[PDB]
């Protein structure tokens, strides 16, 4: 069965230079392999943690991430103004991957852009597009990510730098995950499009971290916005 993560708070209130540990908890044992993701206000998401305690590139050491079997955490010391911000983990242990619902912080050349969401009725149709630039990117794995209006992020699929294919349950036959290695360009083809699709919908890189098939999504577009109702 699917791996559910569980982040207990969903905003934690501090001052500035405090000190705050953000929990997070596994369903089952995910073998350390567990991602942070930084969401701004603005909605700018980035990868914070991986691999349960390794920091990406351009994160400071303010930020210690800790745990093992199920329980896992982010310490964030002397907290800063841009701390300010959502914070999600992610289990990369098992297909599919799977997010916490994250924790909102409150006080007291790599490039992603998407293109083609917009408004359609239930059965409708759209092509999302995501153009790379600044890495060689026939020789990464890329995903699509999608936010919805409730914040929940959710894996949508995966491509492999070859065109292996992986869908989440929910979408399979559904959508349709593909790439030009060529032009440098993600697809994901929606087809019969329901009202929970309604999301915005990123396109991310995916980086190897650990063999045979664990990645952290170290860049995030943008997004592009998929809208389904009736109305």
């Known amino acids: 069965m699917d791996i559910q993560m569980t982040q207990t708070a969903s905003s934690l209130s501090a001052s500035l230079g405090d000190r705050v540990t953000i929990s997070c908890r596994a369903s089952?044992?995910?073998?350390?392999?567990l991602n942070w993701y930084q969401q701004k206000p603005d909605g700018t998401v980035t990868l914070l943690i991986y691999?349960?305690?390794i920091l990406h590139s351009g994160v400071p050491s303010r930020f210690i991430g800790s745990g093992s079997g199920t329980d896992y955490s982010l310490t964030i010391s002397n907290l800063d103004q841009e701390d300010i911000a959502t914070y999600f983990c992610?289990?990369?242990?098992?297909?599919?991957?799977?997010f916490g619902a994250g924790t909102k912080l409150e006080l007291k050349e790599v490039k992603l852009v998407e293109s083609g969401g917009g408004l359609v009725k239930p059965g409708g149709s759209l092509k999302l597009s995501c153009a790379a630039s600044g890495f060689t990117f026939s020789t990464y794995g890329m995903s699509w990510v999608r936010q919805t209006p409730e914040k929940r992020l959710e894996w949508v699929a995966s491509?492999?730098?070859?065109?292996?294919?992986y869908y989440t349950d929910i979408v399979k036959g559904r959508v349709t995950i593909s790439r030009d290695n060529d032009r440098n360009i993600l697809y994901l083809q929606m087809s019969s499009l329901r009202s929970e699709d309604t999301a915005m919908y990123h396109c991310?890189?995916?980086?190897?971290?650990?063999?045979?098939?664990?990645?952290?999504?170290?860049?995030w577009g943008q997004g592009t916005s998929v809208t389904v109702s009736s109305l």
């Open positions: 089952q044992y995910i073998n350390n392999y």
């Open positions: 491509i492999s730098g070859g065109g292996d294919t």
């Open positions: 991310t890189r995916g980086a190897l971290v650990r063999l045979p098939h664990y990645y952290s999504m170290d860049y």
């Open positions: 691999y349960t305690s």
């Open positions: 992610q289990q990369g242990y098992t297909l599919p991957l799977t």
